[PDB]
Structures are given as structure tokens and as C-alpha cells.
Design an enzyme around this catalytic site. Structure first.
Site, PDB file in Angstrom:
ATOM      1  N   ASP A   2     -17.224 -27.549  -0.646  1.00 56.47           N
ATOM      2  CA  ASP A   2     -17.710 -27.162   0.580  1.00 56.47           C
ATOM      3  C   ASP A   2     -17.511 -25.601   0.769  1.00 56.47           C
ATOM      4  OD1 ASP A   2     -18.934 -27.256   3.246  1.00 56.47           O
ATOM      5  OD2 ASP A   2     -16.954 -27.764   4.092  1.00 56.47           O
ATOM      6  N   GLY A  29     -11.481 -26.145  11.452  1.00 59.34           N
ATOM      7  CA  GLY A  29     -11.841 -26.595  10.081  1.00 59.34           C
ATOM      8  C   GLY A  29     -12.434 -27.946   9.953  1.00 59.34           C
ATOM      9  N   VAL A  74      -7.908 -28.934  13.532  1.00 63.70           N
ATOM     10  CA  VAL A  74      -7.533 -27.669  14.133  1.00 63.70           C
ATOM     11  C   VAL A  74      -6.824 -26.937  13.034  1.00 63.70           C
ATOM     12  CG1 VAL A  74      -6.804 -26.289  16.025  1.00 63.70           C
ATOM     13  CG2 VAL A  74      -7.745 -28.485  16.397  1.00 63.70           C
ATOM     14  N   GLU A  90      -1.263 -20.486   2.564  1.00 61.05           N
ATOM     15  CA  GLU A  90      -0.574 -19.141   2.832  1.00 61.05           C
ATOM     16  C   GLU A  90      -1.653 -18.395   3.752  1.00 61.05           C
ATOM     17  OE1 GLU A  90      -1.699 -15.895  -0.084  1.00 61.05           O
ATOM     18  OE2 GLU A  90      -2.316 -17.504  -1.262  1.00 61.05           O
ATOM     19  N   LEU A 111      -3.734 -15.501   5.274  1.00 56.94           N
ATOM     20  CA  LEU A 111      -4.533 -14.298   5.055  1.00 56.94           C
ATOM     21  C   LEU A 111      -5.146 -13.961   6.322  1.00 56.94           C
ATOM     22  CD1 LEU A 111      -4.766 -15.833   2.242  1.00 56.94           C
ATOM     23  CD2 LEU A 111      -6.006 -13.630   1.461  1.00 56.94           C
ATOM     24  N   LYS A 156     -17.890 -21.901   1.626  1.00 56.03           N
ATOM     25  CA  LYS A 156     -18.573 -21.133   2.581  1.00 56.03           C
ATOM     26  C   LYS A 156     -17.744 -19.777   2.968  1.00 56.03           C
ATOM     27  CE  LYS A 156     -16.961 -24.695   5.560  1.00 56.03           C
ATOM     28  NZ  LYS A 156     -17.227 -25.874   6.490  1.00 56.03           N
TER      29      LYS A 156
HETATM   30  N1  LIG Z   1      -5.521 -19.594   5.188  1.00 56.59           N
HETATM   31  C1  LIG Z   1      -6.330 -19.038   6.053  1.00 56.59           C
HETATM   32  N2  LIG Z   1      -5.638 -18.082   6.707  1.00 56.59           N
HETATM   33  C2  LIG Z   1      -6.490 -17.910   7.686  1.00 56.59           C
HETATM   34  N3  LIG Z   1      -6.505 -16.696   8.557  1.00 56.59           N
HETATM   35  C3  LIG Z   1      -7.497 -16.416   9.486  1.00 56.59           C
HETATM   36  C4  LIG Z   1      -8.903 -15.538   8.896  1.00 56.59           C
HETATM   37  C5  LIG Z   1      -9.891 -15.006   9.660  1.00 56.59           C
HETATM   38  C6  LIG Z   1      -9.304 -14.289  10.963  1.00 56.59           C
HETATM   39  C7  LIG Z   1      -8.083 -14.961  11.736  1.00 56.59           C
HETATM   40  C8  LIG Z   1      -6.947 -15.497  10.696  1.00 56.59           C
HETATM   41  S1  LIG Z   1      -7.914 -18.933   8.063  1.00 56.59           S
HETATM   42  C9  LIG Z   1      -7.320 -19.789   6.533  1.00 56.59           C
HETATM   43  C10 LIG Z   1      -7.708 -20.833   5.956  1.00 56.59           C
HETATM   44  O1  LIG Z   1      -7.490 -21.698   4.979  1.00 56.59           O
HETATM   45  C11 LIG Z   1      -9.154 -21.815   6.803  1.00 56.59           C
HETATM   46  C12 LIG Z   1     -10.274 -22.164   5.826  1.00 56.59           C
HETATM   47  C13 LIG Z   1     -11.266 -22.623   6.575  1.00 56.59           C
HETATM   48  C14 LIG Z   1     -11.345 -22.997   7.938  1.00 56.59           C
HETATM   49  C15 LIG Z   1     -10.318 -22.121   8.807  1.00 56.59           C
HETATM   50  N4  LIG Z   1     -10.366 -22.398  10.140  1.00 56.59           N
HETATM   51  O2  LIG Z   1      -9.372 -22.097  10.706  1.00 56.59           O
HETATM   52  O3  LIG Z   1     -11.152 -23.040  10.592  1.00 56.59           O
HETATM   53  C16 LIG Z   1      -9.107 -21.837   8.136  1.00 56.59           C
END
Ligand SMILES: Nc1nc(NC2CCCCC2)sc1C(=O)c1cccc([N+](=O)[O-])c1
Length: 282
Positions: A119, A13, A17, A73, A75, A121
Site C-alpha cells: 500500500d 492511518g 489514528v 521513528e 520524520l 503512497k
Molecule cells: N513516521 C511518521 N512520521 C510522520 N510525521 C508527519 C509527516 C507529515 C507532517 C506531520 C508529521 S507521519 C509518519 C507515518 O509513519 C505515517 C504513515 C502513513 C500515514 C500516517 N498518518 O498519520 O496518517 C503516518
């Protein structure tokens, strides 16, 4: 590890990480974000108060062993992967419309509470099997203050303005809207100047007429090439006129002229909005 069980690293992120983890006490599955300042702790903690169906809930702020973690949370899919998975057929218009509508509701909510994202995206737009889409990371940019994608950056940010407004989020959302429709990023720049010039080549090089004050922005150079604006019907075909009208209002150069999330929700484009079920392969 003391309070969680790592399931797996799920990504890198903006601040560190991000892992899929399981709370040791409750058994709940969450997105645990490690942050790579006391001012920030207090500020971010206030975000735990935000509650809206279209905002990924910030479950907790954990400051232990002099390390900072944000618990969100979880997703199962993000919009970036969903768009990639839907590239052959494209996301159905009714679903693009539903997602855009929900995203604007999330922005309207956050903006009404004086919280910007800055930011947005596809990576931080999360979706579930029930047709909902939610925005993650609102308010972190202001609290923390800074390869990164520049594709969704508003022009005022690229021109060095250090004062942000709700309009930067509307710009990013407009870019995402265009990408869902065409199945290709609208402005895929590889550098800040390339990002800026890609915007200029499509929307025309801005001037004082369309954007009063633009020539006084920190990084504006009188030497910027002067490109003519392209016909908007060429940018996001085959989106209909309601969609093109709304998109144009989200992509106005002057942030002050850019449509608000609240006003956008009333645009004719959403006259027939519904909430379809997406086909998610998990
Ligand atoms: N809440 C949340 N649930 C996630 N499940 C993944 C979704 C994509 C498939 C694998 C599980 S990702 C996430 C983030 O908030 C998040 C936002 C920006 C970036 C990232 N990131 O890992 O780089 C994560």
C-alpha cells in the site's frame, strides 16, 4: 498516556489514528500508531529487525491494556505534502531522481527480506531535512490483512488477485515517480472500476499477449472496453527517455515482467544520481 505524552494527532492511518508523541522515559519524539490477533503481534515484532536508511524504523510494538500500538521513528514531512508545497515550481529533477533511487533501495532491501508493503503512497513516504526519503509501514498489510486511496494500486490487485508479489510495490512506486514529475496523480480513480479504466485508457486494455493469464483473473470481465495504448511520451512530459524507459518497466501489466527494485537501481536513468538538499518548510 501512561508511557507517552501526546503532542498532537497527526493523521488517520490505514489501521487507526497516528499521533506525534513523546516517550515519557526517554523524551524521544515518535509517530505512535494505534491499531484499531496473536499471529499479528509475533509477525509485526519481526519487523523491528528491519534496519535500512530508507525504511522508517519500527521502534516498538506495544501490547498493553488489550490495545495495540506501533511506535515508529518520526520524520517531519511526507511526500504528499512536499509535492503539494512544490506544485508551483515542481520538485527539481535531481531531487526526484534522488528520492526515486532511495525508494528503490528501500524496496530492494525489504523485498530481499521477503517483506512487501502492498500500500505504498505519498502519505507513507517520509522525508527529512538532510535529503533522505524513507518508506513506512512495510509488512503491515500481510500481518493485519485489511476513504482509502486506490491511485497507486497495481492492476492485478484491482482485478481481484489475492496473491501478492514484490511487483505491486514497483507499480505503486512507478505511479509516485510519475506524480513527482508531472505534479499530478497518474491514475486518480474514484472507485475500483474507475481506477482500473483510467489505467486501461492510458496503457491500453490488457490482453493475453501483454499479460498471459489476465483473462482468468477473478474480476476480469470480457466486457471491459478495449482502449488503445497511448504514446508514452504524452503521459509524463517532459521526462527524458531514460526516465520514460524506467517508468515503462515499472508499469508493465504482467507483474512478472515488471522490473525489480534491484534491477531498477542499475537503470541508466541513475547514471548521474546525486543527493540534493530539499527546501523544507516545517
Ligand atoms: N513516521 C511518521 N512520521 C510522520 N510525521 C508527519 C509527516 C507529515 C507532517 C506531520 C508529521 S507521519 C509518519 C507515518 O509513519 C505515517 C504513515 C502513513 C500515514 C500516517 N498518518 O498519520 O496518517 C503516518
Amino acid at each position: 498516556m501512561e508511557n507517552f505524552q501526546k503532542v498532537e494527532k497527526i493523521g488517520e492511518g490505514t489501521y487507526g489514528v497516528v499521533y506525534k508523541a513523546r516517550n515519557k522515559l526517554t523524551g524521544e519524539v515518535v509517530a505512535l500508531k494505534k491499531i484499531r490477533p496473536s499471529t499479528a503481534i509475533r509477525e509485526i515484532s519481526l519487523l523491528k529487525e528491519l534496519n535500512h536508511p530508507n525504511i522508517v524504523k519500527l521502534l516498538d510494538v506495544i501490547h498493553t491494556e488489550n490495545k495495540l500500538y506501533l511506535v515508529f521513528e518520526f520524520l517531519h514531512q511526507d511526500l504528499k505534502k512536499f509535492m503539494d508545497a512544490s506544485a508551483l515550481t515542481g520538485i527539481p529533477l535531481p531531487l526526484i531522481k534522488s528520492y526515486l533511487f532511495q525508494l528503490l533501495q528501500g524496496l530492494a532491501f525489504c523485498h530481499s527480506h521477503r517483506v512487501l508493503h502492498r500500500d505504498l503512497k505519498p502519505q507513507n513516504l517520509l522525508i527529512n531535512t538532510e535529503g533522505a526519503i524513507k518508506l513506512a509501514d512495510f509488512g503491515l498489510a500481510r500481518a493485519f490483512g485489511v476513504v482509502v486511496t486506490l491511485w497507486y494500486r497495481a492492476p492485478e490487485i484491482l482485478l481481484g488477485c489475492k496473491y501478492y508479489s514484490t511487483a505491486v510495490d514497483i507499480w505503486s512506486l512507478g505511479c509516485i515517480f510519475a506524480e513527482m514529475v508531472t505534479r499530478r496523480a497518474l491514475f486518480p480513480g474514484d472507485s475500483e472500476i474507475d481506477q482500473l479504466f483510467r489505467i486501461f485508457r492510458t496503457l491500453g486494455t490488457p490482453d493475453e499477449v501483454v499479460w498471459p493469464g489476465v483473462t482468468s483473473m477473478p474480476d476480469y470481465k470480457p466486457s471491459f472496453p478495449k482502449w488503445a495504448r497511448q504514446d508514452f511520451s504524452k503521459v509524463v512530459p517532459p521526462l527524458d527517455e531514460d526516465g520514460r524507459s524506467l517508468l515503462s518497466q515499472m508499469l508493465h501489466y504482467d507483474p512478472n515482467k515488471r522490473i525489480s527494485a534491484k534491477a531498477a537501481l542499475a537503470h541508466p536513468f541513475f547514471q548521474d544520481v546525486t543527493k540534493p538538499v530539499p527546501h523544507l518548510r516545517l
